[PDB]
């Protein structure tokens, strides 16, 4: 079975470089055209480029022709993307795929791709790594028709993604909802993690939300206590 | 030129035939032959559809495809649950040496029950008031379909900026969550009686509201 397997993805600021690796397995790498295909997020599909069988030529999408070169080394079984000068319009998620057909594309042919990786991301932003503050969003006094109380916590202002939020050192499970991240018009990321517990606890027991952000190295946890009302 | 154009949603109910459509040029789909991809966003596509109209081995007997001119077609004959995503198609463009995606379609397998939104609602934190910010978070869970429309209202009264609302995105629930954040000085906060989210989904308005008194 054919696998592709990438690697290499990180964040980055504008300018800056990266290398992609796609390691194979399950066929004779030497014998097809390679593809990178890329997805940024929200949007389609869009075509990178194509490196022959024997890698005498190299096609581009105009919007990276000059700063990305792809190679291949067929006594590795491996391709390569080196990605220079890149742009925050060049975030997603990066595929190699291979192409099915006779080692090349033409006016003859082109069979596309056959089989695919599982995706490297990239992410080019002139944000700077920047950890979390952590706001508790206290259960309100304020009843609610049902055996419900919500509290929080916000996690707010942060790059990159991803955060871990656990509760009560993740001995605390039943009834957590974390949302997805707001991307702000900052380029900062803020999330909201609630658990939803009966009301009757609420002052009976004692829930901390453990927030780490590994990128920053930013570990905090917050007590999240009933207002003094 | 780069761009396949295809549709950008196809509907249906179960059982019913959909078909897609992906309209190229002379240069490309006219030119070389046309695949079909299926891919849930984010993941790894999977190859449908090669060469107009094979199927690869796996692939369901109600996937056909078809070709002619410079416009190429998907057809899904007998609309399953399992077929709600997106499908893109692609071809070689012979004049700019490219190899093309289509701009991609979404499906949705129609009915499913609408499901009412859960709203709830936390006021600025004491300690965010202290760092002289001020952020009332208003969050959306459990509705089908996805599409809600947020509004924040301070006293009688539309609040004007400072709304950041996430799209709403997919559980594993195969209901929707969406964020709403309203970003204030703790002035303005305190400067009101009242704060409200209110969340509009299918012809229903849900509202919540908050208010400075802790403890007043």
């Known amino acids: 079975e054919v696998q592709l397997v990438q690697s290499g993805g990180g964040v980055v600021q504008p300018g800056r470089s990266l290398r992609l690796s796609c390691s194979s397995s399950?066929?004779?790498?030497?014998?097809?055209?390679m593809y990178w295909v890329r997805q940024a997020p929200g949007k389609g599909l869009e075509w990178v480029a194509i490196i022959w069988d024997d890698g005498s030529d190299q096609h581009y999408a105009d919007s990276v022709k000059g700063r990305f070169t792809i190679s291949r080394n067929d006594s590795k079984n491996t391709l390569f993307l080196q990605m220079d000068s890149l742009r925050p319009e060049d975030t997603g998620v990066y595929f190699c795929?291979?192409?099915?057909?006779?080692?090349?594309?033409?006016?003859?042919?082109?069979?596309?791709?056959?089989?695919w990786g599982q995706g490297t991301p990239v992410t080019v932003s002139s944000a700077s790594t920047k950890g979390p503050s952590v706001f508790p969003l206290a259960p309100s006094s304020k009843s609610t028709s049902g055996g419900t109380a919500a509290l929080g916590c916000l996690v707010k202002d942060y790059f990159p993604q991803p955060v871990t939020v656990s509760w009560n050192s993740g001995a605390l499970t039943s009834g957590v909802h974390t949302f997805p991240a707001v991307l702000q018009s900052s380029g900062l990321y803020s999330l909201s993690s609630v658990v939803t517990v009966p009301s009757s606890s609420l002052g009976t027991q004692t829930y901390i939300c453990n927030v780490n952000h590994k990128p920053s190295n930013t570990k905090v946890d917050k007590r999240v206590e009933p207002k003094s009302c | 030129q780069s761009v396949l154009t295809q549709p950008p949603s196809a509907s249906g109910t179960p059982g019913q035939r959909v078909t897609i459509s992906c309209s190229g040029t002379?240069?490309?789909?006219?030119?070389?032959?046309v695949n079909w991809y299926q891919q849930l966003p984010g993941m790894a596509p999977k190859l449908l559809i090669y060469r107009d109209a094979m199927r690869p081995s796996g692939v369901p007997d109600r996937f056909s495809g078809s070709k002619s001119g410079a416009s190429a077609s998907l057809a899904i004959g007998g609309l399953q649950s399992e077929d709600e995503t997106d499908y893109y198609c692609?071809?070689?463009?012979?004049?700019?040496?490219?190899?093309?995606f289509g701009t991609g379609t979404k499906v949705t397998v129609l009915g499913q029950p609408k499901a009412n939104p859960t709203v709830t609602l936390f006021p600025p934190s004491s300690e965010e008031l202290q760092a002289n910010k001020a952020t009332l978070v208003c969050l959306i869970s459990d509705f089908y379909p996805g599409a809600v429309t947020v509004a924040w209202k301070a006293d009688g009264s539309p609040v004007k900026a400072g709304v950041e609302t996430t799209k709403p995105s997919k559980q594993s629930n195969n209901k929707y969550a969406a964020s709403s954040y309203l970003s204030l000085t703790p002035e303005q906060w305190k400067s009101h009686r009242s704060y409200s989210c209110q969340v509009t989904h299918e012809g229903s308005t849900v509202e919540k509201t908050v208010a400075p008194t802790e403890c007043s």
């Open positions: 002379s240069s490309n789909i006219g030119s070389s032959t």
């Open positions: 795929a291979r192409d099915g057909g006779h080692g090349f594309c033409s006016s003859a042919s082109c069979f596309g791709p056959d089989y």
């Open positions: 399950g066929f004779i790498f030497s014998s097809y055209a």
């Open positions: 692609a071809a070689w463009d012979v004049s700019l040496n490219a190899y093309v």
